[PDB]
């Protein structure tokens, strides 16, 4: 009799929808249904629904077609709490059999979501509602992390205005390419045009643009996809596919600017840990990166710390400032220029001036020069 | 028999303290105590305590020595909800009886606070903990707003590392000074060294440093004190005491840069409503102020805006800029300059930029100029 | 797609009702519906229903997503019979009050349209007048709009209940005050001694005969200028001639001797006695000060003034009969008899109803031997 | 080591109190303490305290481990002023009742010892008599032990309140019933018409002058055999001579004519009138049936019988004065006057207190002209 | 000022005890105190107490010496909920920093418990109150399972009436001994005298006697100690240190009784999965064991299934019944004897007869023979 005891092949979409509206006092029908039964260990039937709109535990529990409760937070994990429906156990009596029901429900929900994905138009419709939940699942459900990660969709430097899957990112990977590059910030345009992605983008190396704050917490646990390790492009020591000749070309620029690097680190005092030669810049003269362990600019923005300033070996500014500096180490104008570079990189790398008026003053002095005063 | 029924001369702080710790399960004793009896139309008895530490309403109510309840909506308003103690009514056979109690408690609490504000040592302990509540009450409680305002203490451009009262501010007001000037920002240093206070500081017109967030909510309601209106130093049209001579000197500068203001506004088009000759700057070449009607940069940052660019007529950058722009109002370089100045002033005024990359690129183009 | 976001002029009463019943689990449909929207400030839509029967809340939506029902501060407590939904566009403490003020605005709007159609205002008012009155008591900003919904029986009005607007159309040129009385029965108050001279003068009196009425008029102080006055309390202003103003003077001194001598021999029982201008056929009545509790106030659980009738035979006799030779158990027997009888007639309880009953037994014992 | 497992004879009142105060957050110590143990069936210990002031529960331990305080069924609701601890040895629905019955046994034991010491029973009884009475009402198994704790004012007892045991020592040989009255004041009930003949006969009457009393006596039906009877209700048994039994017959027929003719002209107001054996000096009173609500029952919010006094002058006159020629506005005026006066004297309210007050105004108007 | 902010070296035991009684309205003082502070990541001080008696979350939370709450079930795991005390954070503002506080509290509680253990008289006093909690911890706190397992104490066939640690069990292990043997049942005597332990005990191989029901749930997750894997002696395929000669002696008894094993399995029909030759019996003629995965006799007793009947190669009864049976396979008296053996093993191995009267009848027939009737 009750709808969850009928054979799925029999029940129609109108029928389900009606049951759903009736179960949830929702004004519209479900977005997706998953309706199944498990055998042997425990016997149970389940009818699960995905709402059209994300809510701002509530599976109804039955035994032998008799209502028990629905406070049962043990049936599904926090992150799938948007799921709604009934579980009809063919008899439960410790109390942990509930774990076995939970695992099945997650199995099937993940199965449902995969199927939604294979419908490539209108996975949009689920994903724009529930990707926060996916991502939250990746953080805290280590057992299903891999499956959950196949459901993610992102903007990438290759994707234009489409969100693409990690699987697709992988099939486009280059040859010596060993790593999945990502960036986290507030906007697609803000990251696309960032100093950190200039060189990857010039060489056709694809960057995932993670542009929602949950992403910060998500990448914390998403270490890898298809055995390729995910690397942040705003952290120290960006590693990128090396040629037998670039690795030599690098160490050659490294010891070239080793000197200027040492004088720069000297005056920048305790504002920066290291001053290294960059491997991620083309047009931008320098940038600020943060240590492998630590807080990013995006994270300090959410907080409402170990910096490295990377210089660009091939930028005229840096290049000439290597002349000036090795000519006169303690020179008062190199000093204020070094800070001004630093201060500029700070801003354009997502950070926030310790004192913005001293920075203002620094600009003022410079433009006073510009206009030919002093 | 119970302590609150005893006569306040016969009770010692050691005894009051012991009661308080019993009452509230604290590990330390109270900071202050008010034990009073209202006699007359409705007689009742109250023993009130201020804690030494602000907690993360909570008054026990008794009728004729018999406990009734403690979760009592509107025995005191929310802003005084830190007070703890008991009220023992001598007669009771939701109502309007509670209004009488509520007014009495609120009088005596404000009484206690004024008293505490002698003994300067101890007011520091109280205010350090409960400044927020005093302010929260100025916003909500109009019947008491003036008493609440005399309890306020602030860091000012005159005061050093001590915080002073509004009364004291007033004792130092100049001649022809009609306004109390305040700035609101994140830190004392930030505000004390903001472009907005340069000239007030030079003339020795005191400025109040408002550096807590509640202050933004608070001055929304503290309109004036002791007949003198409070004015923000970051909003348009800063009025100053100005001698007959100086006014004539300010008017010359207005028309001398009447032209530069015009061309600057044209270039800055959509980003600025008005550019004006400043009266508030000395060392800085310009700053950004917000329309009187609109809302600030301190406020924009607390969410977790009509602008004026004021320009310093006595500044080398500005006096040089006049010359260059009047020589060619279309010089792409004058333009690049103006936008630089605008961006830098925007940063200096607590605003965040539209696109910190383009601003950075500007800087770079420049620092590549003065180098080859 | 949901009903509250559909255009109100498309939606029919069977649909509203289907929705109402479905929202509330009522078996009968709603009694009134108000479906409006708001713009500018804060855009939102509301669908509010008035149930047919008094009880003893509101579903809040943001962008068509359910948030909560409980929401303690959406309508004020006196309008909590109202069921419905509010759907907000832009809502991400201080702004709920913006919603609360609009919802109340449109409820009162609804109630005013409801009042226009008499052949059915009855159905509303019988059920929720208590709420209106509780409204006047607790809500100051709308006290005025709320009192125009009040309906009362009056001296002028027989079996119907009329409005204060209505009362006012019937006021007389000189009349500055709206006169009311509080009691337990329509009959009881209409035949009371207080109304007599007012009625004789053609000045309408409102019969307030719910207990709630006693609590409501604490705060309802005026209407269209005019101030309200109980007829059971000391000091009653009454439009007076230059002629009658001269004549009310006569009595307050002719009977002043009696007024000094009557309270003299009634102390502990009643405190001060004056000439009464509210009396025609009755010889005395107790009025109840201004601070002091009234006979109907005290009932739902002190300060009595005896007012005697100048032009009454009983009073005129008992004047000169007392004035010369101020004693004998008989002059005392009647003065006590006037107090007690006046005290029951004004709706009070004698401490001992034997001291009164035995007195009737003395009066009846020598009515025949 | 904890106090409730220590031997009661070691532990001092300062310790009990220190414990009590610490248990309850009272500022003053306990008023009574009962510390007992139980064996056999189910071993357990209890420490129970009686607070000095009435409120407006019990910590349960098993093997010295805390379980819960709330425990809804440890003492019955009427004994919920009692604070304390119960510590059980063997407790691993049906057995809590075994504890509940023992705790009540020892509470009543405590209250009985409390009553032995008069120079302090006052302190208990003033505070918790309401609870005792609520006990009689709800707890049948202990109704008897509970009524021996009841203390009342009586006709016989002046300014003191006595027990029913005490009442019984003063009963007369022939007396089968315990007579009580319910009213609002001691004075009010002692001077009431109902008590007159009982008092004259030397039969003690209990003055029950709390409202709660009205509710309590619903279920308190007897004591030491003797049954209780209200003096404000129809049919009052009274020890009678062979002589007086013959004489009460005279009146019930002499006045039967009047009894037929009096109810004839009082219908809607009162239903049936008989000769009264509760009256001496008063001429009439209303009694209130057996089903029907009484004047004091109706007060905390119908079926009245007029009982007239045979040996009264007013009644004897009004007999033959009516019998021959049964009319004139005067015979009616007095019969109505007897009803109303009898109705206020019995503690009722007239529908309109003007119909009565005007009648006094007719009687007084020709008491002098 | 407050006791948890004072230096432990300063506060006395009387002082702590008093604070404790006052914090818990407990009539007696604490059994143990642990009082510490953590630095850097978050700063906080904590004062934790162990009660004398097991209760039938309640750490009080403070920030900058200001009370916050105590419902905070995130501060310690279910199984340590008997712990009572205060946590004073030097400022907490997501909300998951709580995890970092939790880990510290568990670290320290486990540290406390270890110290209690090193006091070898009067660890009794903690352990008899809280071993259920230890064991519950082993089930569900996989990260600390190893440390938690060092706290366990058991009766063993070697220990007499002392409870001993797994570490001690290990230092007594034999030479080819690779495994920690245990048995679960209701009583020390019931397990000591069980058929399953006869041979281990004859050879000096030590058996842990697990005699509380939580043990059943505990061994479910306690796979190993010091790299030695725990094996149940009531399960199929007891493996025991093999000599170059016993392994041969076994396979020799195996094929000897291979025949009788097949006829026995034949009549015992679907009551038993296998009938094998035993390797755990000396005096007892046979016994019932249950499959590696499955339910034990003890577990079916808690439920208010795959059996193997092992025969004893050296028991006269079995030995002669191998003669009788290979002489007459389908003989009616061998049949009823085979069941009677089975039925007896069922009872003495913790199980419960499907039909006890048919068993009774079986005995009756036998004793009717005994008395010489039939």
XYZ file of C-alpha atoms in Angstrom, chain A residues 25 27-29 52-56, chain C residues 1-2 4 61 63-67:
18
model
C 4.777 20.705 2.759
C 5.057 23.801 -2.767
C 6.981 22.218 -5.661
C 7.916 18.628 -6.446
C 14.732 21.826 -5.924
C 16.065 24.453 -3.570
C 18.709 24.120 -0.847
C 17.207 24.305 2.680
C 18.331 27.056 5.053
C 4.128 29.306 -8.630
C 3.168 29.300 -4.951
C 1.357 33.931 -2.206
C 9.949 32.600 3.636
C 13.222 33.935 -1.792
C 10.614 31.117 -1.706
C 12.674 29.116 0.800
C 11.166 28.220 4.192
C 13.024 29.662 7.194
